[PDB]
Nucleic acid binder design. Structure first.
Ligand SMILES: [Mg+2]
Ligand SMILES: [Mg+2]
Length: 132
RNA sequence: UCGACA
DNA sequence: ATGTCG
């Protein structure tokens, strides 16, 4: 039932809102495929959203049909909607993450993909493989 | 009034 | 504790 031939993504933070990073790993091997440099201020859900969209772009660039696992129901909805409905304040500290979010939404509105975005079933399978 | 994803 | 949706 775990689709091993997949990319798993996860966010990591220090505080929330606080410093956010994310990474994508091969679900089978645990090899780290991408890891975003820490963003100074962001939310968990923004980060989880950026991680999925980063995965889509990564797989589309590489002509891969693998699905993406996320454990974030929110992020999965935001990607489906092409809209990150975050209520993080806008200021000079949050301008970088909000610009990345806006750019990700714009990517979603300008590209197609068939990548299935699947919910990692933590209750049954343990932590997602990209966890921090 | 919670419940749930983390 | 906090960000989010059902
Ligand atoms: Mg996650
Ligand atoms: Mg995690």
């Amino acid at each position: 039932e775990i689709i091993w031939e997949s990319l798993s993504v996860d966010v990591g933070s220090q505080g929330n809102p606080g410093i956010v990073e994310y990474k994508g790993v091969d679900t089978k091997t645990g090899e780290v495929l991408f890891e975003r440099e820490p963003i100074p201020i962001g939310t968990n859900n923004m980060g989880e959203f950026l991680a999925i969209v980063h995965g889509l772009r990564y797989l589309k660039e590489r002509n891969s049909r693998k699905p993406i696992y996320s454990n974030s129901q929110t992020a999965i909805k935001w990607v489906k909607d092409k809209k990150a409905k975050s209520t993080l304040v806008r200021n000079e500290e949050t301008a970088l993450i909000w610009k990345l979010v806006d750019e990700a939404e714009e990517w979603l509105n300008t590209h197609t993909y068939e990548t299935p975005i699947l919910k990692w079933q933590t209750d049954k399978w343990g932590e997602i493989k990209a966890d921090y």
